[PDB]
Design a protein around this ligand. Structure first.
Ligand SMILES: [Cl-]
Ligand code: NA
Length: 141
């Protein structure tokens, strides 16, 4: 995963976009940091991801009303998905701190990374839905 491409839309005051970039950067940050890190360090990293995720979700809540009825369904479903994904991520994080300095620690991290990476893929996916819904509204041929 890179931070997201920019397609044809102007992103200067694109909040959805800014926030998705935030949440994506935060996942990447955590990932590069994990394997060497004690719990004193990895719990806050995961806190950060949740914050960036809440920020994104409120931004989105505000944008729905401005986009066509036809599109609302998916945008909500794709929202659920990201709450779910974070659910999964916290699970694996509690398991890894439950299992520190044991042998099974590190498969517990491999499961954190797996879930963090779905979170970021699904963020990027939300972006696309939103963009497509805008393009519709702005009147794309
Ligand atoms: Cl916006
Ligand atoms: Na509409």
């Amino acid at each position: 995963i890179s931070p997201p491409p920019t397609a044809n839309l102007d992103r200067s005051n694109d909040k959805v976009y800014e926030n998705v970039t935030g949440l994506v950067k935060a996942v990447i940050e955590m990932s590069s940091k994990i394997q060497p890190a004690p719990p004193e360090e990895y719990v806050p990293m995961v806190k950060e991801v949740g914050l960036a995720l809440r920020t994104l979700l409120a931004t989105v809540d505000e944008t729905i009303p401005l986009l066509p009825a036809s599109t609302h369904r998916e945008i909500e479903m794709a929202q659920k998905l990201l709450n779910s994904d974070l659910g999964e991520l916290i699970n694996k994080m509690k398991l890894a701190q439950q299992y520190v300095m044991t042998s099974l620690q590190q498969e517990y991290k491999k499961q954190m990374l797996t879930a963090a990476h779905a979170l970021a893929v699904d963020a990027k996916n939300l972006l696309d839905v939103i963009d497509q819904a805008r393009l519709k509204m702005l009147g794309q041929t």
